């Protein structure tokens, strides 16, 4: 009889939800674990995937378990995380691209006439390798390693072959460190390890000899590979003050695109604030010296990742969030006052009506007066910039041409209008805020048109577009551009309450 699942199929006990329904910023972690190859970025949609890939003992799983286990004021969860590799020390050339679960011990029968071809600087080959016994994959790796050692080539003289159980990757590390390029090609010999081993099939990652690089340069390569993240951090041991300052300056070079979260002690908090004064986009979180790490630096990242900007009411404040896993950092008013001068965030404890309450006390970012001090406005600006850029690129991609005339301006405004409607719906845009004389003068200065401050007071925003001509640097040819200006208001929030009780 037919299995009856051919017509109606019902699965019970899993109930997986829809993967993606909106736009969400996600955390990026720069780790020095040797498992991840330097040149790739890996995204995990669930904590169990991190557990399987890295292992239970790894600190990455410890971070991921805390990160995925978070519920915001609205019932939301991050649902995504990404990892990148930082090359802390010098690395020898390696070849690893093997993700297929081929380690079913199906290597017997390939013993006869092995001829693996390696395309290095100078090509060299390997004689027949006997893997008929195939007692274990470790033994097969050792037999392969010995036949690599048989060569007199400096790279292959002391090359090593390893194996990892949790993943399914076969790795070879060159004998020389600092410089070199190693690669393999697929041969036509039927008894070749090119197909038997993972190398030279579909995706294989080739990494050349590399010297140690600074973290500021390290994060740039990761951003070049992919930029689908927000609020990155550095894992492992804490960085030096100069390295932190350099990364902060690099982040400030980008204009309101990412947040840098760093964990510091009470002693070092005063010193860092002097160096990282200004440099918008940097968050300082105080670390407790009497307990475990607790990953306090991840506190703003989780709040950012939980937000869904497609839904109304997305915008939210950062000054009251309870993290049961985290521990207490400060408990005195004078210590809190000293920390607040340095614009540091922490978890503070207080008692009200016999109940102790602990929450993320502050949401202040270090930066200049022109920059957005609060975290919520910074995140809203990030989302707004991303949406506007995406809309403009879509308009360019889906039209024959955009004339340098009034028609082009009308087209560009029409494309941008729905994004502005969504921004008003989210809570990024607020209406009815009173405008002072200084702000009125600034608005009339930025936009030559007067009475625009009236519109930003009433409706809450103002936008206009013009076109002009310029010449690019690469060629002497003249081209045309467009310019637009957007003014909007920042919302206020209540964070302190005072009252008086009078009896008769």
């Amino acid at each position: 009889m037919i299995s009856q699942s051919r017509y109606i199929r019902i699965i019970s006990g899993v109930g997986a939800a829809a993967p993606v329904a909106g736009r969400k910023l996600i955390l990026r972690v720069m780790t020095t674990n040797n498992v991840i190859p330097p040149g790739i970025v890996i995204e995990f949609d669930n904590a169990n995937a991190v557990l399987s890939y890295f292992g239970a003992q790894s600190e990455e799983y410890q971070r991921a378990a805390a990160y995925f286990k978070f519920i915001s004021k609205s019932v939301n969860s991050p649902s995504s995380i990404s990892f990148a590799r930082w090359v802390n020390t010098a690395i020898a050339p390696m070849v690893v691209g093997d993700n297929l679960p081929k380690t079913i011990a199906d290597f017997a029968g390939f013993s006869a006439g092995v001829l693996t071809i390696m395309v290095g600087a100078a090509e060299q080959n390997i004689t027949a390798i006997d893997t008929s016994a195939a007692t274990s994959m470790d033994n097969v790796a050792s037999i392969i390693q010995t036949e690599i050692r048989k060569n007199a080539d400096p790279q292959l003289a002391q090359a090593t072959v390893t194996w990892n159980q949790n993943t399914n990757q076969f790795t070879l590390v060159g004998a020389t460190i600092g410089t070199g390029v190693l690669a393999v090609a697929k041969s036509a010999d039927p008894q070749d390890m090119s197909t038997a081993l993972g190398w030279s099939t579909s995706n294989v990652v080739n990494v050349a000899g590399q010297s140690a690089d600074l973290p500021d340069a390290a994060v740039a390569k990761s951003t070049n590979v992919s930029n689908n993240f927000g609020s990155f951090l550095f894992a492992g041991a804490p960085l030096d003050n100069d390295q932190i300052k350099a990364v902060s300056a690099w982040n400030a070079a980008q204009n309101n695109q990412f947040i840098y979260t760093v964990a510091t002690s009470l002693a070092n908090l005063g010193t860092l604030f002097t160096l990282v004064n200004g440099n918008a986009g940097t968050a300082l979180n105080v670390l407790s010296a009497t307990a475990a790490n607790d990953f306090v630096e991840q506190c703003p990242s989780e709040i950012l990742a939980a937000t869904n900007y497609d839904e109304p009411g997305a915008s939210q404040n950062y000054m009251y969030y309870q993290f049961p896993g985290r521990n207490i950092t400060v408990s005195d008013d004078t210590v809190a006052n000293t920390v607040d001068k340095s614009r540091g965030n922490y978890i503070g404890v207080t008692q009200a009506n016999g109940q102790q309450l602990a929450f993320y006390q502050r949401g202040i970012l270090c930066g200049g007066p022109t920059d957005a001090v609060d975290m919520n406005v910074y995140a809203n600006e990030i989302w707004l910039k991303s949406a506007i850029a995406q809309a403009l690129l879509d308009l360019f991609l889906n039209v024959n041409a955009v004339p340098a005339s009034s028609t082009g301006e009308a087209m560009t405004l029409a494309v941008l209008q729905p994004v502005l409607d969504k921004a008003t719906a989210n809570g990024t845009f607020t209406y009815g805020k009173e405008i002072s004389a200084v702000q009125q003068q600034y608005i009339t200065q930025v936009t030559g048109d007067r009475r625009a401050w009236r519109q930003v007071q009433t409706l809450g925003y103002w936008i206009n577009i013009t076109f002009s001509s310029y010449t690019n640097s690469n060629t002497g040819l003249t081209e045309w551009k467009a310019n637009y200006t957007l003014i909007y208001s920042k919302g206020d929030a209540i964070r302190f309450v005072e009252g008086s009780d009078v009896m008769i």
């Binding site: 009034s406 028609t407 301006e409 087209m411 405004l413 029409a414 494309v415 729905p418 007067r450 519109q455």
Partner: protein, 144 residues
């Protein structure tokens, strides 16, 4: 004289289309007066005032056989109600570019009125097309 209108639709015309033929003896881009408040006078001369609620209304006349008119007819037929036809619920947007700047943008709206087929007048010429619209939010960005 150099006046254009760019229409966009969320589903039918995601990228939008432009109309430039505004027709001869009809009034293009017409808007009825807007009522904003009402008053009442009580006995002994007291006056009370309250705010009324209304939305912006616009109508544009076009040449019987032009690309913009054909696109407008396509939009109206897409949103229309009929015996056996799918109804695409889409919100329309309009931006008007006048000579000497003065851009005006309307965000949320829908078609209201139209004429299904062409009609010939007594003189022997094709008649024009009303194509009424209504909108919710209006922003003026060209006071300069």
């Amino acid at each position: 004289f150099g006046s254009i209108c760019a229409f966009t639709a969320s589903r039918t015309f995601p990228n939008g289309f432009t109309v430039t033929e505004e027709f001869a003896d009809a009034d293009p881009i017409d808007s009825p007066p807007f009522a904003a408040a009402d008053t009442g006078a009580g006995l002994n001369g007291d006056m009370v005032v309250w705010n009324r609620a209304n939305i912006l209304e616009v109508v544009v006349n076009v040449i019987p056989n032009t690309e913009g008119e054909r696109n407008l007819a396509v939009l109206l037929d897409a949103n229309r109600t009929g015996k056996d036809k799918s109804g695409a619920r889409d919100v329309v947007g309009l931006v008007v570019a006048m000579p000497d700047g003065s851009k005006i943008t309307c965000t949320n709206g829908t078609p209201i009125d139209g004429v299904l087929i062409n009609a010939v007048a007594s003189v022997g010429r094709l008649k024009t097309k009303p194509y009424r619209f209504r909108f919710e939010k209006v922003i003026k960005a060209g006071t300069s």
